[PDB]
């Protein structure tokens, strides 16, 4: 996260770290959506242009973390994966359309002050909150600058951007399964996700029921925190029928 700040303890208790077993390293963020299901970006698990195609046994998820690098004894919980589910129409060939994946844990994780699921939006909460200018919150342990790494989880609040502005900022084809967020050059304030944040959550706190909802998944950006560029996020609500289908079936 660029131009963010240190998270408070327990501020993002749904935050998950996707961790490579060997070599031991941060791969991506992710989020806890129930005691057995973790949501992330498909490209965190499958990206053939980079020879990336992880299997379950390659990975762990670390839940309840605050420190990036520390083993947080008596606080974090480390879970093995039972099964990865990639959206069947995830477009790794072109533009990361439908950049979403689920991971089922081998065992349920125990909730605590540090570990708690985020809500997924209903149609109405999505319609109400996914509006240009409305801010969400992005969290992660990714790099602090494009060109370094945080001691603890970082947080930044960023406004959703008008779709024409998103589209006009890039040559990539933007789909309805994406939204973008970030400040404009003239807005003064700054901030973005960066390398290692992808797969983590973009959340909004509903003013109707005072619950946190995951509206986006950190998907892609051209650079980090560049003027005139914006971060792109998977539109979780648009893909929620797939999420529900996977959870209902498996």
């Amino acid at each position: 996260i660029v131009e963010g700040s240190d998270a408070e303890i327990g501020m993002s208790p749904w935050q998950v770290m996707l961790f490579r077993k060997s070599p031991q390293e941060l791969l991506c963020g992710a989020s806890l959506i129930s005691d057995r299901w973790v949501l992330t970006a498909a490209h965190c698990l499958l990206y053939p242009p980079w020879d990336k195609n992880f299997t379950e046994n390659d990975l762990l998820v670390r839940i309840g973390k605050h420190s990036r690098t520390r083993y947080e004894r008596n606080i974090e919980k480390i879970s093995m994966l039972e099964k990865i589910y990639i959206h069947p129409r995830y477009n790794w060939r072109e533009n990361l359309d439908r950049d979403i994946a689920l991971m089922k844990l081998k065992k349920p994780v125990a909730f605590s002050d540090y570990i708690h699921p985020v809500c997924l939006p209903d149609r109405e909460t999505a319609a109400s909150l996914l509006q240009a200018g409305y801010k969400g919150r992005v969290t992660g342990w990714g790099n602090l600058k494009e060109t370094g790494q945080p001691s603890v989880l970082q947080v930044v609040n960023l406004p959703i951007v008008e779709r024409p502005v998103c589209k006009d900022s890039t040559r990539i084809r933007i789909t309805d399964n994406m939204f973008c967020a970030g400040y404009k050059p003239d807005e003064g304030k700054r901030g973005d996700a960066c390398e290692g944040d992808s797969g983590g959550p973009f959340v909004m706190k509903s003013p109707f029921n005072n619950r946190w909802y995951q509206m986006g998944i950190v998907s892609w950006g051209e650079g980090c925190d560049r003027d005139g560029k914006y971060g792109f996020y998977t539109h979780v609500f648009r893909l929620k029928k797939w999420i529900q289908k996977v959870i209902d079936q498996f």
């Binding site: 961790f19 077993k21 060997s22 762990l60 690098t69 480390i78």
Partner: peptide, 11 residues
């Protein structure tokens, strides 16, 4: 870079 995690999670 990362502190070693307990071996039980790697088996």
């Amino acid at each position: 870079d990362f502190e070693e995690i307990p071996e039980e999670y790697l088996q």
